[PDB]
Design a protein around this ligand. Structure first.
Ligand SMILES: [Zn+2]
Length: 32
């Protein structure tokens, strides 16, 4: 695998760069 796919795959449901969005979804999803 080598941690590589490219298609929004975070420990939440997004991409590395979008990892900070997993919580910051401006919703009840997360806050920080
Ligand atoms: Zn994430």
């Amino acid at each position: 695998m080598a941690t590589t796919m490219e298609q929004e795959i975070c420990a939440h449901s997004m991409t590395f760069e979008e990892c900070p969005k997993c919580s910051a979804l401006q919703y009840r999803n997360g806050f920080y």
